[PDB]
Every structure is written in structure tokens, then in C-alpha cells.
């Protein structure tokens, strides 16, 4: 409705807005998937989000930590094969970035914005897990039930664990897309 209600209901988006790529800030964010309404499985997650790009992933843990990632590419691309016919694990571009809102508040861009293959590992997903940020650790990792997950330092984003404990339980997961071509 009005400005106050819109801001109140979507505070985390308005806090994040200035971190998005500048061209994206001119589009309208739309809720693609929420564990509060749409099921709670990678299978229903893919069906709803996989042809959108870019997307914004927001995790609220049962420990009241809030973090997530801007994802450059459609999750549909998780199954792309190279020219040998071997499925590619990691996909995406260097516009992908991690963020945390609570307890800390930080943006971890790709370390190559200013190297090796292992610092260019953005997104990966299959029937057992979805992960973001790879290379000697996984920045965000979540299981097929979107119930439990882990977080670690990774070399693509040189981040710390986005919550103090290395693990978390998901209270709610939200995915936003962008419309307005």
C-alpha cells in the first residue's frame, strides 16, 4: 500500500538496495519463493525460481541471524554440461556476492572485482544441496529439505562464517526476482 507499510513489510530489501548492481536498482523486486507459504524442499524451490535471473536469497535462522546472497544466474543452469558432456558443478558470474544483515552487517563481493579457478566458484545446486561461494569451504550450504545448513569461509568471497556457529537451522528462506524490462 502506502510508503510506510511497504517499507515496514520489506525492510531487509530496502537495507540491501544500494548494494545491488546499479542497473538492477531500477527494477521491481518480486517474491518468488518463501518457505512460509510454498513448501520446504529444493524440488519446490527449483520449480518456482529456476528461470529467474538475477535473484536475491535471504535466510533467517532460528538463531535470529540474517544473511544471504545476490545470485547472478538462473538456477536452471545448475545442470549445464561442458563440451566433454561432464556436468559443471559451479556456475555464475562475478556479480554474485554474499551479504549479512545480522548480527554483523557486511557485503562480500567477488575477490576478482579488483587469480585461480578456485576463487571463481559462485553457485552450485543439485537434488541434495544448494550452495553459494566455494573454494576450500562453502560460504552458504543448505540441504534438500531447506531445514539445516552450514556456513564457512570460502576463497571466492574471502568471507567469515556469516553466523558465529558454523551451522544453522532455517526459520524462513525467501527468494526475490526482478521485473520491469
CSV table of N, CA and C in Angstrom, one decimal:
chain,number,residue,atom,x,y,z
A,1,UNK,N,0.8,-1.2,0.0
A,1,UNK,CA,0.0,0.0,0.0
A,1,UNK,C,0.9,1.3,0.0
A,2,UNK,N,0.7,2.1,1.0
A,2,UNK,CA,1.4,3.4,1.1
A,2,UNK,C,2.9,3.1,1.4
A,3,UNK,N,3.7,4.2,1.5
A,3,UNK,CA,5.1,4.1,1.6
A,3,UNK,C,5.5,3.4,2.9
A,4,UNK,N,4.9,3.8,4.0
A,4,UNK,CA,5.3,3.3,5.4
A,4,UNK,C,5.1,1.8,5.4
A,5,UNK,N,3.9,1.3,5.0
A,5,UNK,CA,3.6,-0.1,5.1
A,5,UNK,C,4.5,-0.9,4.2
A,6,UNK,N,4.8,-0.4,3.0
A,6,UNK,CA,5.7,-1.0,2.0
A,6,UNK,C,7.1,-1.2,2.6
A,7,UNK,N,7.6,-0.1,3.2
A,7,UNK,CA,8.9,-0.1,3.8
A,7,UNK,C,8.9,-1.1,5.0
A,8,UNK,N,7.9,-1.0,5.8
A,8,UNK,CA,7.9,-1.9,7.0
A,8,UNK,C,7.9,-3.4,6.7
A,9,UNK,N,7.1,-3.7,5.7
A,9,UNK,CA,7.0,-5.2,5.3
A,9,UNK,C,8.2,-5.7,4.6
A,10,UNK,N,9.0,-4.9,4.1
A,10,UNK,CA,10.2,-5.3,3.3
A,10,UNK,C,11.4,-4.6,3.7
A,11,UNK,N,11.7,-4.5,5.0
A,11,UNK,CA,12.8,-3.6,5.5
A,11,UNK,C,14.1,-4.2,5.0
A,12,UNK,N,14.3,-5.5,5.0
A,12,UNK,CA,15.6,-6.0,4.6
A,12,UNK,C,15.9,-5.7,3.1
A,13,UNK,N,15.0,-5.7,2.2
A,13,UNK,CA,15.2,-5.3,0.9
A,13,UNK,C,15.7,-3.8,0.8
A,14,UNK,N,15.0,-2.9,1.5
A,14,UNK,CA,15.4,-1.5,1.4
A,14,UNK,C,16.8,-1.3,2.0
A,15,UNK,N,17.1,-2.1,3.0
A,15,UNK,CA,18.5,-2.0,3.6
A,15,UNK,C,19.5,-2.5,2.6
A,16,UNK,N,19.2,-3.5,1.8
A,16,UNK,CA,20.1,-4.1,0.8
A,16,UNK,C,20.2,-3.3,-0.5
A,17,UNK,N,19.2,-2.4,-0.7
A,17,UNK,CA,19.0,-1.9,-2.1
A,17,UNK,C,20.3,-1.3,-2.7
A,18,UNK,N,21.0,-0.5,-1.9
A,18,UNK,CA,22.2,0.2,-2.5
A,18,UNK,C,23.3,-0.8,-2.8
A,19,UNK,N,23.3,-2.0,-2.3
A,19,UNK,CA,24.4,-3.0,-2.6
A,19,UNK,C,24.2,-3.7,-4.0
A,20,UNK,N,23.0,-3.6,-4.6
A,20,UNK,CA,22.8,-4.3,-5.8
A,20,UNK,C,23.5,-3.6,-7.0
A,21,UNK,N,23.8,-4.3,-8.1
A,21,UNK,CA,24.3,-3.6,-9.3
A,21,UNK,C,23.4,-2.5,-9.7
A,22,UNK,N,24.0,-1.4,-10.1
A,22,UNK,CA,23.2,-0.1,-10.2
A,22,UNK,C,22.1,-0.3,-11.2
A,23,UNK,N,22.3,-1.0,-12.3
A,23,UNK,CA,21.2,-1.2,-13.2
A,23,UNK,C,20.0,-1.9,-12.7
A,24,UNK,N,20.2,-2.8,-11.7
A,24,UNK,CA,19.2,-3.6,-11.1
A,24,UNK,C,18.3,-2.8,-10.2
A,25,UNK,N,18.8,-1.7,-9.6
A,25,UNK,CA,18.0,-0.9,-8.7
A,25,UNK,C,16.8,-0.2,-9.3
A,26,UNK,N,16.7,-0.2,-10.7
A,26,UNK,CA,15.6,0.4,-11.4
A,26,UNK,C,14.5,-0.5,-11.6
A,27,UNK,N,14.6,-1.8,-11.2
A,27,UNK,CA,13.6,-2.8,-11.4
A,27,UNK,C,12.8,-3.1,-10.1
A,28,UNK,N,11.6,-3.8,-10.3
A,28,UNK,CA,10.8,-4.0,-9.1
A,28,UNK,C,11.1,-5.4,-8.5
A,29,UNK,N,11.3,-5.5,-7.2
A,29,UNK,CA,11.6,-6.8,-6.7
A,29,UNK,C,10.3,-7.5,-6.4
A,30,UNK,N,10.2,-8.8,-6.7
A,30,UNK,CA,9.0,-9.6,-6.5
A,30,UNK,C,9.4,-10.9,-5.8
A,31,UNK,N,8.6,-11.3,-4.9
A,31,UNK,CA,8.8,-12.5,-4.1
A,31,UNK,C,8.5,-13.8,-4.9
A,32,UNK,N,9.6,-14.6,-5.2
A,32,UNK,CA,9.4,-15.8,-6.0
A,32,UNK,C,9.1,-17.0,-5.2
A,33,UNK,N,9.6,-17.1,-3.9
A,33,UNK,CA,9.6,-18.3,-3.1
A,33,UNK,C,9.7,-18.0,-1.7
A,34,UNK,N,8.9,-18.5,-0.8
A,34,UNK,CA,9.1,-18.4,0.6
A,34,UNK,C,8.7,-19.7,1.3
A,35,UNK,N,9.6,-20.2,2.2
A,35,UNK,CA,9.3,-21.4,3.0
A,35,UNK,C,8.1,-21.2,3.9
A,36,UNK,N,7.6,-20.0,4.1
A,36,UNK,CA,6.4,-19.8,4.9
A,36,UNK,C,5.2,-20.2,4.2
A,37,UNK,N,5.2,-20.3,2.8
A,37,UNK,CA,4.0,-20.5,2.0
A,37,UNK,C,4.1,-21.6,0.9
A,38,UNK,N,5.3,-21.9,0.5
A,38,UNK,CA,5.4,-22.6,-0.8
A,38,UNK,C,5.9,-24.0,-0.7
A,39,UNK,N,5.9,-24.6,0.4
A,39,UNK,CA,6.6,-25.9,0.6
A,39,UNK,C,8.0,-25.6,1.2
A,40,UNK,N,8.7,-26.7,1.4
A,40,UNK,CA,10.0,-26.5,2.0
A,40,UNK,C,10.9,-27.7,1.5
A,41,UNK,N,11.4,-27.5,0.2
A,41,UNK,CA,12.2,-28.5,-0.4
A,41,UNK,C,12.9,-27.9,-1.6
A,42,UNK,N,14.1,-28.5,-2.0
A,42,UNK,CA,14.7,-28.0,-3.2
A,42,UNK,C,13.9,-28.2,-4.4
A,43,UNK,N,13.1,-29.3,-4.4
A,43,UNK,CA,12.2,-29.6,-5.5
A,43,UNK,C,11.2,-28.5,-5.8
A,44,UNK,N,10.5,-28.0,-4.8
A,44,UNK,CA,9.6,-26.9,-5.0
A,44,UNK,C,10.3,-25.6,-5.2
A,45,UNK,N,11.5,-25.4,-4.6
A,45,UNK,CA,12.3,-24.2,-4.8
A,45,UNK,C,12.7,-24.1,-6.3
A,46,UNK,N,13.2,-25.2,-6.9
A,46,UNK,CA,13.6,-25.1,-8.3
A,46,UNK,C,12.4,-24.7,-9.2
A,47,UNK,N,11.3,-25.4,-9.0
A,47,UNK,CA,10.1,-25.2,-9.8
A,47,UNK,C,9.7,-23.7,-9.9
A,48,UNK,N,9.8,-23.1,-8.7
A,48,UNK,CA,9.4,-21.7,-8.7
A,48,UNK,C,10.4,-20.7,-9.1
A,49,UNK,N,11.7,-20.9,-8.9
A,49,UNK,CA,12.7,-19.8,-9.1
A,49,UNK,C,13.6,-20.0,-10.2
A,50,UNK,N,13.7,-21.2,-10.9
A,50,UNK,CA,14.9,-21.6,-11.6
A,50,UNK,C,15.0,-20.9,-12.9
A,51,UNK,N,14.0,-20.3,-13.5
A,51,UNK,CA,14.2,-19.5,-14.7
A,51,UNK,C,14.3,-18.0,-14.5
A,52,UNK,N,14.4,-17.5,-13.2
A,52,UNK,CA,14.6,-16.1,-12.9
A,52,UNK,C,16.1,-15.7,-12.8
A,53,UNK,N,16.5,-14.6,-13.4
A,53,UNK,CA,17.8,-14.1,-13.0
A,53,UNK,C,17.8,-12.6,-13.2
A,54,UNK,N,18.6,-11.9,-12.3
A,54,UNK,CA,19.3,-12.4,-11.1
A,54,UNK,C,18.3,-12.6,-10.0
A,55,UNK,N,18.7,-13.2,-8.9
A,55,UNK,CA,17.8,-13.4,-7.7
A,55,UNK,C,18.6,-12.9,-6.5
A,56,UNK,N,17.8,-12.7,-5.4
A,56,UNK,CA,18.2,-12.3,-4.1
A,56,UNK,C,17.7,-13.3,-3.1
A,57,UNK,N,18.7,-14.0,-2.4
A,57,UNK,CA,18.3,-15.0,-1.5
A,57,UNK,C,18.6,-14.5,-0.1
A,58,UNK,N,17.5,-14.7,0.8
A,58,UNK,CA,17.6,-14.2,2.1
A,58,UNK,C,17.2,-15.3,3.1
A,59,UNK,N,18.1,-15.6,4.1
A,59,UNK,CA,18.0,-16.6,5.1
A,59,UNK,C,17.8,-16.0,6.4
A,60,UNK,N,16.8,-16.4,7.1
A,60,UNK,CA,16.6,-16.0,8.5
A,60,UNK,C,16.7,-17.3,9.4
A,61,UNK,N,17.7,-17.4,10.2
A,61,UNK,CA,18.0,-18.5,11.0
A,61,UNK,C,17.1,-18.5,12.3
A,62,UNK,N,17.0,-19.7,12.9
A,62,UNK,CA,16.3,-19.8,14.2
A,62,UNK,C,17.1,-19.1,15.3
A,63,UNK,N,18.4,-18.8,15.1
A,63,UNK,CA,19.2,-18.0,16.0
A,63,UNK,C,19.2,-16.5,15.7
A,64,UNK,N,18.2,-16.1,14.9
A,64,UNK,CA,18.0,-14.7,14.6
A,64,UNK,C,19.1,-14.0,13.8
A,65,UNK,N,19.9,-14.8,13.1
A,65,UNK,CA,20.9,-14.3,12.2
A,65,UNK,C,20.2,-14.1,10.8
A,66,UNK,N,20.6,-13.1,10.0
A,66,UNK,CA,20.1,-12.8,8.7
A,66,UNK,C,21.2,-12.6,7.8
A,67,UNK,N,21.2,-13.4,6.7
A,67,UNK,CA,22.3,-13.3,5.7
A,67,UNK,C,21.7,-13.9,4.4
A,68,UNK,N,22.5,-13.8,3.3
A,68,UNK,CA,22.0,-14.3,2.0
A,68,UNK,C,23.0,-14.0,0.9
A,69,UNK,N,22.5,-14.0,-0.3
A,69,UNK,CA,23.3,-13.7,-1.4
A,69,UNK,C,22.5,-13.2,-2.6
A,70,UNK,N,23.2,-12.3,-3.4
A,70,UNK,CA,22.7,-11.9,-4.7
A,70,UNK,C,23.3,-12.9,-5.7
A,71,UNK,N,22.4,-13.6,-6.4
A,71,UNK,CA,22.9,-14.6,-7.4
A,71,UNK,C,22.7,-14.1,-8.8
A,72,UNK,N,23.8,-14.1,-9.6
A,72,UNK,CA,23.8,-13.6,-10.9
A,72,UNK,C,23.0,-14.4,-11.9
A,73,UNK,N,22.8,-15.7,-11.8
A,73,UNK,CA,22.4,-16.6,-12.9
A,73,UNK,C,21.2,-17.4,-12.5
A,74,UNK,N,20.5,-17.9,-13.5
A,74,UNK,CA,19.3,-18.8,-13.1
A,74,UNK,C,19.8,-20.1,-12.6
A,75,UNK,N,19.1,-20.6,-11.6
A,75,UNK,CA,19.4,-21.9,-11.0
A,75,UNK,C,19.2,-23.0,-12.0
A,76,UNK,N,18.4,-22.8,-13.1
A,76,UNK,CA,18.3,-23.7,-14.2
A,76,UNK,C,19.6,-24.1,-14.7
A,77,UNK,N,20.6,-23.3,-14.6
A,77,UNK,CA,21.9,-23.6,-15.2
A,77,UNK,C,22.7,-24.6,-14.4
A,78,UNK,N,22.2,-25.0,-13.2
A,78,UNK,CA,22.9,-26.0,-12.4
A,78,UNK,C,23.3,-27.3,-13.2
A,79,UNK,N,22.5,-27.6,-14.3
A,79,UNK,CA,22.7,-28.9,-15.0
A,79,UNK,C,23.4,-28.7,-16.3
A,80,UNK,N,24.0,-27.6,-16.6
A,80,UNK,CA,24.7,-27.4,-17.8
A,80,UNK,C,25.9,-28.3,-17.9
A,81,UNK,N,26.1,-28.9,-19.0
A,81,UNK,CA,27.3,-29.8,-19.2
A,81,UNK,C,28.3,-29.0,-20.1
A,82,UNK,N,29.6,-29.3,-19.9
A,82,UNK,CA,30.7,-28.8,-20.7
A,82,UNK,C,30.7,-29.5,-22.0
A,83,UNK,N,31.8,-29.3,-22.8
A,83,UNK,CA,31.9,-30.0,-24.1
A,83,UNK,C,32.3,-31.4,-24.1
A,84,UNK,N,32.9,-31.9,-23.0
A,84,UNK,CA,33.1,-33.3,-22.8
A,84,UNK,C,31.8,-34.0,-22.4
A,85,UNK,N,30.7,-33.3,-22.1
A,85,UNK,CA,29.5,-33.9,-21.6
A,85,UNK,C,29.5,-34.1,-20.1
A,86,UNK,N,30.5,-33.5,-19.4
A,86,UNK,CA,30.5,-33.6,-18.0
A,86,UNK,C,29.7,-32.4,-17.3
A,87,UNK,N,28.8,-32.7,-16.4
A,87,UNK,CA,28.1,-31.7,-15.7
A,87,UNK,C,29.0,-30.7,-15.0
A,88,UNK,N,28.7,-29.4,-15.1
A,88,UNK,CA,29.5,-28.4,-14.5
A,88,UNK,C,29.0,-28.2,-13.1
A,89,UNK,N,29.9,-28.4,-12.1
A,89,UNK,CA,29.5,-28.1,-10.7
A,89,UNK,C,29.1,-26.7,-10.5
A,90,UNK,N,30.0,-25.8,-10.6
A,90,UNK,CA,29.8,-24.4,-10.3
A,90,UNK,C,29.5,-23.5,-11.5
A,91,UNK,N,28.6,-22.6,-11.3
A,91,UNK,CA,28.3,-21.7,-12.4
A,91,UNK,C,28.0,-20.3,-11.9
A,92,UNK,N,27.8,-19.3,-12.7
A,92,UNK,CA,27.5,-17.9,-12.3
A,92,UNK,C,28.6,-17.0,-12.8
A,93,UNK,N,28.4,-15.7,-12.4
A,93,UNK,CA,29.3,-14.6,-12.8
A,93,UNK,C,29.8,-13.9,-11.5
A,94,UNK,N,30.8,-13.1,-11.7
A,94,UNK,CA,31.4,-12.2,-10.7
A,94,UNK,C,30.5,-11.1,-10.1
A,95,UNK,N,29.3,-10.9,-10.6
A,95,UNK,CA,28.4,-10.0,-10.0
A,95,UNK,C,27.7,-10.7,-8.7
A,96,UNK,N,27.8,-12.0,-8.6
A,96,UNK,CA,27.3,-12.7,-7.4
A,96,UNK,C,28.1,-12.1,-6.2
A,97,UNK,N,27.3,-11.9,-5.1
A,97,UNK,CA,28.0,-11.5,-3.8
A,97,UNK,C,27.2,-12.0,-2.7
A,98,UNK,N,27.9,-12.2,-1.5
A,98,UNK,CA,27.3,-12.5,-0.3
A,98,UNK,C,27.1,-11.3,0.6
A,99,UNK,N,26.1,-11.4,1.5
A,99,UNK,CA,25.9,-10.3,2.5
A,99,UNK,C,25.5,-11.0,3.8
A,100,UNK,N,25.6,-10.2,4.8
A,100,UNK,CA,25.0,-10.5,6.1
A,100,UNK,C,24.3,-9.2,6.6
A,101,UNK,N,23.2,-9.3,7.3
A,101,UNK,CA,22.5,-8.2,7.9
A,101,UNK,C,22.6,-8.3,9.4
A,102,UNK,N,22.5,-9.4,10.0
A,102,UNK,CA,22.6,-9.7,11.5
A,102,UNK,C,23.4,-10.9,11.7
A,103,UNK,N,24.2,-11.0,12.8
A,103,UNK,CA,24.5,-9.9,13.8
A,103,UNK,C,25.3,-8.8,13.2
A,104,UNK,N,26.3,-9.2,12.4
A,104,UNK,CA,27.2,-8.3,11.6
A,104,UNK,C,26.4,-7.8,10.4
A,105,UNK,N,27.0,-6.7,9.8
A,105,UNK,CA,26.4,-6.2,8.5
A,105,UNK,C,27.5,-5.9,7.6
A,106,UNK,N,27.6,-6.7,6.5
A,106,UNK,CA,28.8,-6.6,5.6
A,106,UNK,C,28.4,-7.1,4.2
A,107,UNK,N,29.1,-6.7,3.2
A,107,UNK,CA,29.0,-7.1,1.8
A,107,UNK,C,30.3,-7.8,1.4
A,108,UNK,N,30.3,-9.0,1.0
A,108,UNK,CA,31.5,-9.7,0.5
A,108,UNK,C,31.4,-9.9,-1.0
A,109,UNK,N,32.0,-9.0,-1.8
A,109,UNK,CA,32.0,-9.1,-3.2
A,109,UNK,C,33.0,-10.2,-3.7
A,110,UNK,N,33.0,-10.5,-5.0
A,110,UNK,CA,34.0,-11.4,-5.5
A,110,UNK,C,35.4,-10.8,-5.4
A,111,UNK,N,36.3,-11.7,-5.0
A,111,UNK,CA,37.7,-11.2,-4.8
A,111,UNK,C,38.4,-10.7,-6.1
A,112,UNK,N,37.8,-11.1,-7.2
A,112,UNK,CA,38.4,-10.7,-8.5
A,112,UNK,C,37.9,-9.4,-9.1
A,113,UNK,N,37.0,-8.7,-8.3
A,113,UNK,CA,36.5,-7.4,-8.8
A,113,UNK,C,37.6,-6.4,-9.0
A,114,UNK,N,38.6,-6.4,-8.2
A,114,UNK,CA,39.8,-5.5,-8.3
A,114,UNK,C,40.4,-5.5,-9.7
A,115,UNK,N,43.7,-14.3,-10.9
A,115,UNK,CA,43.7,-15.3,-9.9
A,115,UNK,C,43.3,-16.7,-10.4
A,116,UNK,N,43.2,-17.7,-9.5
A,116,UNK,CA,43.0,-19.1,-9.9
A,116,UNK,C,41.5,-19.5,-10.0
A,117,UNK,N,41.3,-20.7,-10.5
A,117,UNK,CA,40.0,-21.3,-10.8
A,117,UNK,C,39.2,-21.3,-9.5
A,118,UNK,N,39.9,-21.6,-8.3
A,118,UNK,CA,39.2,-21.9,-7.1
A,118,UNK,C,38.8,-20.6,-6.4
A,119,UNK,N,39.1,-19.4,-6.9
A,119,UNK,CA,38.5,-18.2,-6.4
A,119,UNK,C,37.3,-17.6,-7.3
A,120,UNK,N,36.8,-18.5,-8.2
A,120,UNK,CA,35.8,-18.1,-9.1
A,120,UNK,C,34.6,-19.1,-9.1
A,121,UNK,N,34.2,-19.5,-7.9
A,121,UNK,CA,33.2,-20.6,-7.7
A,121,UNK,C,32.0,-20.0,-7.0
A,122,UNK,N,30.9,-19.7,-7.8
A,122,UNK,CA,29.8,-18.8,-7.3
A,122,UNK,C,28.6,-19.6,-6.8
A,123,UNK,N,28.0,-20.4,-7.7
A,123,UNK,CA,26.8,-21.1,-7.4
A,123,UNK,C,26.9,-22.6,-7.8
A,124,UNK,N,26.3,-23.5,-7.0
A,124,UNK,CA,26.1,-24.9,-7.4
A,124,UNK,C,24.9,-25.5,-6.7
A,125,UNK,N,24.2,-26.4,-7.4
A,125,UNK,CA,23.0,-27.0,-6.9
A,125,UNK,C,22.7,-28.3,-7.5
A,126,UNK,N,22.1,-29.2,-6.7
A,126,UNK,CA,21.6,-30.5,-7.2
A,126,UNK,C,20.4,-30.9,-6.4
A,127,UNK,N,20.1,-32.2,-6.4
A,127,UNK,CA,18.9,-32.7,-5.7
A,127,UNK,C,19.2,-32.8,-4.2
A,128,UNK,N,20.4,-32.8,-3.7
A,128,UNK,CA,20.8,-32.9,-2.3
A,128,UNK,C,21.1,-31.6,-1.6
A,129,UNK,N,21.5,-30.6,-2.4
A,129,UNK,CA,22.0,-29.4,-1.7
A,129,UNK,C,22.0,-28.2,-2.7
A,130,UNK,N,22.0,-27.0,-2.1
A,130,UNK,CA,22.2,-25.8,-2.8
A,130,UNK,C,23.4,-25.0,-2.1
A,131,UNK,N,24.3,-24.5,-2.8
A,131,UNK,CA,25.5,-23.9,-2.2
A,131,UNK,C,25.9,-22.6,-2.9
A,132,UNK,N,26.5,-21.7,-2.2
A,132,UNK,CA,27.0,-20.4,-2.8
A,132,UNK,C,28.3,-20.1,-2.2
A,133,UNK,N,29.3,-19.8,-3.1
A,133,UNK,CA,30.6,-19.4,-2.6
A,133,UNK,C,31.5,-20.6,-2.2
A,134,UNK,N,32.4,-21.0,-3.2
A,134,UNK,CA,33.2,-22.2,-3.0
A,134,UNK,C,34.7,-21.9,-3.0
A,135,UNK,N,35.4,-23.0,-2.9
A,135,UNK,CA,36.9,-22.9,-2.9
A,135,UNK,C,37.4,-23.0,-1.4
A,136,UNK,N,37.8,-24.3,-1.0
A,136,UNK,CA,38.3,-24.5,0.3
A,136,UNK,C,37.3,-24.1,1.4
A,137,UNK,N,36.1,-24.6,1.2
A,137,UNK,CA,35.0,-24.2,2.1
A,137,UNK,C,33.8,-23.7,1.2
A,138,UNK,N,32.7,-23.6,1.9
A,138,UNK,CA,31.4,-23.3,1.3
A,138,UNK,C,30.8,-22.2,2.1
A,139,UNK,N,30.6,-21.0,1.5
A,139,UNK,CA,30.1,-19.8,2.2
A,139,UNK,C,28.6,-20.1,2.7
A,140,UNK,N,27.8,-20.6,1.9
A,140,UNK,CA,26.4,-21.0,2.3
A,140,UNK,C,26.1,-22.3,1.7
A,141,UNK,N,25.6,-23.2,2.5
A,141,UNK,CA,25.3,-24.6,2.1
A,141,UNK,C,24.0,-24.9,2.8
A,142,UNK,N,23.0,-25.5,2.1
A,142,UNK,CA,21.7,-25.9,2.6
A,142,UNK,C,21.3,-27.2,2.1
A,143,UNK,N,20.5,-28.0,2.8
A,143,UNK,CA,20.2,-29.3,2.5
A,143,UNK,C,18.9,-29.4,1.7
A,144,UNK,N,18.5,-30.6,1.2
A,144,UNK,CA,17.4,-30.8,0.3
A,144,UNK,C,16.0,-30.5,0.9
A,145,UNK,N,16.0,-30.3,2.3
A,145,UNK,CA,14.7,-30.0,3.0
A,145,UNK,C,14.6,-28.5,3.3
A,146,UNK,N,15.7,-27.8,3.0
A,146,UNK,CA,15.8,-26.3,3.4
A,146,UNK,C,15.5,-26.2,4.9
A,147,UNK,N,16.0,-27.2,5.7
A,147,UNK,CA,15.9,-27.1,7.1
A,147,UNK,C,17.2,-26.8,7.8
A,148,UNK,N,18.3,-27.5,7.5
A,148,UNK,CA,19.6,-27.3,8.1
A,148,UNK,C,20.6,-26.8,7.0
A,149,UNK,N,21.6,-26.1,7.5
A,149,UNK,CA,22.6,-25.5,6.6
A,149,UNK,C,23.9,-25.3,7.4
A,150,UNK,N,24.9,-24.9,6.6
A,150,UNK,CA,26.2,-24.6,7.2
A,150,UNK,C,26.8,-23.4,6.5
A,151,UNK,N,27.8,-22.8,7.1
A,151,UNK,CA,28.5,-21.6,6.6
A,151,UNK,C,29.9,-21.7,7.0
A,152,UNK,N,30.8,-21.3,6.1
A,152,UNK,CA,32.2,-21.5,6.2
A,152,UNK,C,32.9,-20.3,5.4
A,153,UNK,N,34.2,-20.1,5.7
A,153,UNK,CA,34.9,-19.2,4.8
A,153,UNK,C,35.2,-19.9,3.5
A,154,UNK,N,35.1,-19.1,2.4
A,154,UNK,CA,35.4,-19.6,1.1
A,154,UNK,C,36.4,-18.6,0.4
A,155,UNK,N,37.1,-19.1,-0.6
A,155,UNK,CA,38.1,-18.3,-1.3
A,155,UNK,C,37.5,-17.5,-2.4
A,156,UNK,N,36.3,-17.8,-2.9
A,156,UNK,CA,35.7,-16.9,-3.9
A,156,UNK,C,35.4,-15.5,-3.3
A,157,UNK,N,34.9,-15.5,-2.0
A,157,UNK,CA,34.5,-14.3,-1.4
A,157,UNK,C,35.3,-13.9,-0.2
A,158,UNK,N,36.2,-14.7,0.3
A,158,UNK,CA,37.1,-14.4,1.5
A,158,UNK,C,36.3,-13.9,2.6
A,159,UNK,N,35.2,-14.6,2.9
A,159,UNK,CA,34.3,-14.2,4.0
A,159,UNK,C,34.5,-14.9,5.3
A,160,UNK,N,34.1,-14.4,6.4
A,160,UNK,CA,34.0,-15.3,7.6
A,160,UNK,C,32.7,-16.0,7.6
A,161,UNK,N,32.5,-17.0,8.4
A,161,UNK,CA,31.2,-17.6,8.7
A,161,UNK,C,30.2,-16.5,9.0
A,162,UNK,N,29.1,-16.6,8.2
A,162,UNK,CA,28.1,-15.5,8.3
A,162,UNK,C,27.2,-15.6,9.5
A,163,UNK,N,27.4,-16.6,10.3
A,163,UNK,CA,26.9,-16.6,11.7
A,163,UNK,C,28.0,-17.2,12.5
A,164,UNK,N,28.1,-16.9,13.8
A,164,UNK,CA,29.3,-17.4,14.6
A,164,UNK,C,29.5,-18.9,14.7
A,165,UNK,N,28.4,-19.6,15.0
A,165,UNK,CA,28.5,-21.1,14.8
A,165,UNK,C,28.5,-21.4,13.3
A,166,UNK,N,29.2,-22.5,13.0
A,166,UNK,CA,29.3,-22.8,11.6
A,166,UNK,C,28.1,-23.4,10.9
A,167,UNK,N,27.0,-23.6,11.7
A,167,UNK,CA,25.8,-24.3,11.2
A,167,UNK,C,24.6,-23.4,11.6
A,168,UNK,N,23.4,-23.7,11.0
A,168,UNK,CA,22.2,-23.0,11.4
A,168,UNK,C,21.0,-23.8,11.0
A,169,UNK,N,19.9,-23.5,11.6
A,169,UNK,CA,18.6,-24.0,11.1
A,169,UNK,C,17.8,-22.8,10.5
A,170,UNK,N,17.1,-23.1,9.4
A,170,UNK,CA,16.4,-22.1,8.7
A,170,UNK,C,15.0,-21.9,9.3
A,171,UNK,N,14.8,-20.7,9.8
A,171,UNK,CA,13.4,-20.3,10.2
A,171,UNK,C,12.6,-20.0,9.0
A,172,UNK,N,13.1,-19.1,8.1
A,172,UNK,CA,12.4,-18.8,6.8
A,172,UNK,C,13.5,-18.5,5.8
A,173,UNK,N,13.2,-19.0,4.6
A,173,UNK,CA,14.0,-18.6,3.4
A,173,UNK,C,13.1,-17.9,2.4
A,174,UNK,N,13.7,-16.8,1.8
A,174,UNK,CA,13.0,-16.0,0.8
A,174,UNK,C,13.9,-15.8,-0.4
A,175,UNK,N,13.3,-15.9,-1.6
A,175,UNK,CA,13.9,-15.6,-2.8
A,175,UNK,C,13.1,-14.5,-3.6
A,176,UNK,N,13.8,-13.5,-4.0
A,176,UNK,CA,13.2,-12.4,-4.8
A,176,UNK,C,13.8,-12.4,-6.2
A,177,UNK,N,12.9,-12.1,-7.2
A,177,UNK,CA,13.4,-11.8,-8.5
A,177,UNK,C,13.1,-10.3,-8.8
A,178,UNK,N,13.3,-10.0,-10.1
A,178,UNK,CA,13.2,-8.6,-10.5
A,178,UNK,C,12.4,-8.5,-11.9
A,179,UNK,N,11.4,-7.6,-11.9
A,179,UNK,CA,10.6,-7.5,-13.1
A,179,UNK,C,10.7,-6.0,-13.6
A,180,UNK,N,10.4,-5.8,-14.9
A,180,UNK,CA,10.2,-4.5,-15.4
A,180,UNK,C,11.0,-4.1,-16.6
A,181,UNK,N,11.3,-5.1,-17.5
A,181,UNK,CA,12.0,-4.9,-18.7
A,181,UNK,C,11.4,-3.8,-19.6
